[PDB]
Design a protein around this nucleic acid. Structure first.
Ligand SMILES: NCCSC[C@H]1O[C@@H](n2cnc3c(N)ncnc32)[C@H](O)[C@@H]1O
Length: 393
DNA sequence: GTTCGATGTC
DNA sequence: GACATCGAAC
């Protein structure tokens, strides 16, 4: 894992520190950020690097190297500037997640971080740790995944940043070669308040920040790339979430242990559908992509709504809206399942067409770009639906 | 119940 | 690029 030169340069161009100030690079290894900052701003600073793997710690003699777990590190003094690229990843069982540590250690992280939510991520913890290590007025500059702009797992982190100081977010995108992640650079200052969202332009000369929008009273709300168009479209109709209760499919384990489910096709048996069975406007009821089969009528045992024809919206087809009406009412292993709320009148055919329209695809693409490889509930809830498609009585 | 991916694999 | 994880985690 290395950070592209132009990314480091761009980040260094956003960093600031007072003469003789303390500068730190967490999870430094050989310290690419300390080197770049020193070459750009001089040597009149106290350079510190923290690395947990001794084989990786390799700093120049003018910097102070510290062997320790950054997240549980307790220095004597706070810092004026913290910059770097923290490790990303969920802490969990190796068969499913990338970060592997003793449960007791994960317990220590949970105890130390007030923003730790759900499965959380190593990068969220590094952000909180760095902010806590920041001296009043101090500045932090990290490059991390863009997922924290919209995901629930990071609601406390956003709320934390909003109340601890001022934040600027610069969208980069997939700037890490052979690394499947959409990234953003965050410049946080432990003072003031508000949020500034910037887009960037890449050139040979490097990255150039382009001011997109400003939210002076940001309190941790989901961060999006709004435009006059997205705004105009959102107030043109009722949020989809006000018309439908939104549930998710029962998970693979539930099906796998259910006595009515089989690993092979058979009479009276039907496949448990997945995102691969959902297409724009229709459902492929024949193909089996889950390796699971079961009698249709028994599906209501895992989720009661599996017995009722209803609207289905995709979750993992990237940032877009793919919907279809499940007229047969099949058992599903994935996707969103929307049940109309009491008094809600709708036109399935027309609503489906609206959800799959090009206009809708552009709407979500503009707002959430490629932060995450999904259409999340938070995104789905806010989709605007006008009277032509759904009406609340 | 439902969330998230320095995604997993073609 | 196509096309979506899928189950451990809370
Ligand atoms: N800055 C480069 C991206 S992160 C990878 C580096 O982070 C170091 N690292 C991972 N977890 C760490 C932790 N908890 N504390 C300090 N360094 C860490 C790794 O050893 C590796 O050198």
């Amino acid at each position: 894992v290395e950070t592209p030169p132009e990314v480091v340069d761009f980040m260094v161009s956003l960093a600031e520190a007072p003469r003789g100030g303390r500068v730190l690079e967490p999870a430094c290894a050989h310290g690419p950020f300390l080197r770049a900052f020193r070459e750009a701003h001089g040597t009149g600073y106290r350079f510190v690097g923290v690395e947990i793997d001794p084989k990786a710690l390799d700093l120049p003699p003018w910097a102070e190297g510290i062997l320790a777990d950054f997240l549980l590190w307790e220095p004597g003094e706070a810092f004026d500037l913290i910059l770097g690229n923290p490790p990303y990843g969920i802490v969990g069982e190796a068969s499913k997640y990338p970060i592997h540590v003793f449960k007791a250690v994960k317990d220590l992280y949970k105890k130390a971080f007030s923003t730790w939510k759900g499965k959380y991520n190593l990068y969220g913890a590094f952000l909180e740790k760095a902010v806590r290590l920041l001296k009043p007025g101090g500045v932090l500059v990290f490059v991390v995944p863009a997922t924290w702009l919209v995901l629930e797992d990071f609601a406390l982190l956003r709320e934390f940043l909003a109340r601890e100081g001022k934040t600027s977010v610069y969208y980069l995108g997939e700037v890490f070669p052979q690394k499947k992640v959409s990234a953003v650079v965050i410049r946080f200052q432990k003072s003031g308040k508000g949020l500034s969202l910037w887009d960037t332009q890449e050139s040979e000369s490097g990255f150039t920040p382009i001011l997109w929008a400003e939210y002076p009273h940001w309190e941790g709300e989901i961060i999006r790339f709004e435009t006059e168009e997205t705004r105009k479209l959102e107030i043109s109709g009722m949020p989809l979430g006000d018309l439908f209760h939104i549930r998710f499919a029962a998970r693979s384990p539930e099906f796998k242990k259910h006595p009515a489910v089989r690993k092979e096709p058979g009479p009276g048996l039907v496949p448990v559908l997945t995102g691969r069975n959902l297409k724009p406007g229709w459902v492929d009821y024949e193909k089996n992509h889950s390796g699971l089969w079961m009698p249709k009528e028994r599906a209501k045992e895992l989720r009661d709504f599996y017995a009722t024809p209803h609207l289905v919206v995709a979750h993992t087809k990237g940032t877009r809206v793919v919907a279809a009406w499940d007229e047969r009412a099949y058992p599903w292993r994935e996707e969103f399942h929307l049940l109309p709320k009491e008094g809600v009148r709708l036109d399935p055919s027309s609503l489906v067409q609206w959800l799959n329209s090009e206009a809708m695809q552009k709407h979500v693409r503009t707002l959430y770009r490629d932060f995450v490889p999904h259409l999340t509930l938070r995104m789905l809830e806010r989709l605007p639906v006008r009277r032509e498609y759904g009406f609340h009585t």
